[PDB]
């Protein structure tokens, strides 16, 4: 909650350093690579439920997913507080719109990162991020026309 507000509006927090990546590593990815916020919240909630029905496998990535979900929820409840206290629902919709526009992509990177760590393995993700960054930084005539693909686990 103090962390939440720091990471979204305060630019002093790299939430990825503790997991072995960086903000710059995730920023190489094109926005179309990530699913929408709402789909990632669905995936997240399903992974979290698997953490609770088997606390054996509770991971720090589960905890991070949970912090992100409760964050998004706080912004949504603030959006409804505006517009219940004003007249219109259109005030609520305006706040939601501002949140999606300004922080939507930050949420999509964070959620995709912990989900994919729980899905492909963290080392697979870290390696994929390095590969994608190398591709992006390479002059075009020296790189394949297609960026590195993240293949699903066998």
């Amino acid at each position: 909650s103090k962390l939440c507000l720091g990471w979204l509006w305060g630019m002093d927090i790299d939430p990825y350093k503790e997991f072995g990546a960086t903000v710059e590593l995730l920023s190489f990815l094109p926005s179309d690579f990530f699913p929408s916020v709402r789909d990632l919240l669905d995936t997240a909630a399903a992974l979290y439920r698997d953490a609770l029905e088997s606390p054996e496998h509770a991971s720090p990535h589960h905890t991070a997913l949970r912090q992100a979900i409760l964050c998004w929820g706080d912004l949504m409840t603030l959006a409804t507080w505006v517009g219940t206290n004003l007249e219109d629902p259109a005030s609520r919709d305006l706040v939601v719109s501002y949140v999606n526009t300004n922080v939507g992509l930050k949420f999509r990177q964070l959620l995709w990162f912990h989900i994919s760590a729980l899905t492909f393995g963290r080392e697979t993700v870290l390696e994929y991020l390095v590969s994608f960054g190398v591709w992006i930084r390479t002059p075009p005539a020296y790189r394949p026309p297609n960026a590195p693909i993240l293949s699903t686990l066998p």
Partner: single-chain antibody
Framework: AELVLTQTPSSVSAAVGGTVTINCQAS??????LGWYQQKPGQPPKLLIY???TLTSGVPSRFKGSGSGTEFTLTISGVQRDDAATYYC??????????FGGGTEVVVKGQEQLVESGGRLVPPGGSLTLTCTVS????????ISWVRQAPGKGLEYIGI?????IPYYSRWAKGRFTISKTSTTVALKMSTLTASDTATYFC?????????????????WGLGTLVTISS
Amino acid sequence: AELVLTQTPSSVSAAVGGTVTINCQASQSISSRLGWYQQKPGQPPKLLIYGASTLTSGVPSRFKGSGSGTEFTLTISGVQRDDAATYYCLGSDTSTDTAFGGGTEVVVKGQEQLVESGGRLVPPGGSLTLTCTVSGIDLSSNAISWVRQAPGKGLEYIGIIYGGSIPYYSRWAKGRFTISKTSTTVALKMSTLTASDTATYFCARGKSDGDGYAAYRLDPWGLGTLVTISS
């Protein structure tokens, strides 16, 4: 949370030069995330309008999409013989809750490539894997969707896999169907097959809007692979 698209009417007869009106009602607000598709006999579906109003390139201006929220309309004003076809709406509330409408038969009187493979005859209860081989399409920034059509029936949405390789499935498919991704291919594995699974299976490339939803904008399409369950 289950999305249902009620499309009316189910068939329309018009003279060349008449006007054809198709309505789509969604059971929950999908905002603008809706396509209109056109399918002629023996051919894969073709994207006409995405985003409820945006015409795809080459589509004559006699097609007009409109609506938002729960109510959408497709109008063909100058209707022509070349527009005889079945028309489907495709709504996406989320990439799990994405559904086609039931289709409207319209009778008029007077380097990107995807190749499906793996269609076979399969015993009831068997399993199968289909392959979509992708060319000219960067699988890191595009989504690949799977759709099926049973013989003489409508399009049914199965699932989608995004550039970042998170799959999504419709509620009816989840747990019998698995989408997977290679550097060159997308695959669909199907288990516990019955006669209701007999169908043509298509893959199609999803293009994302700025919020990240691709499952309603599908173009291009492969020609499909036929799966038949037989005792």
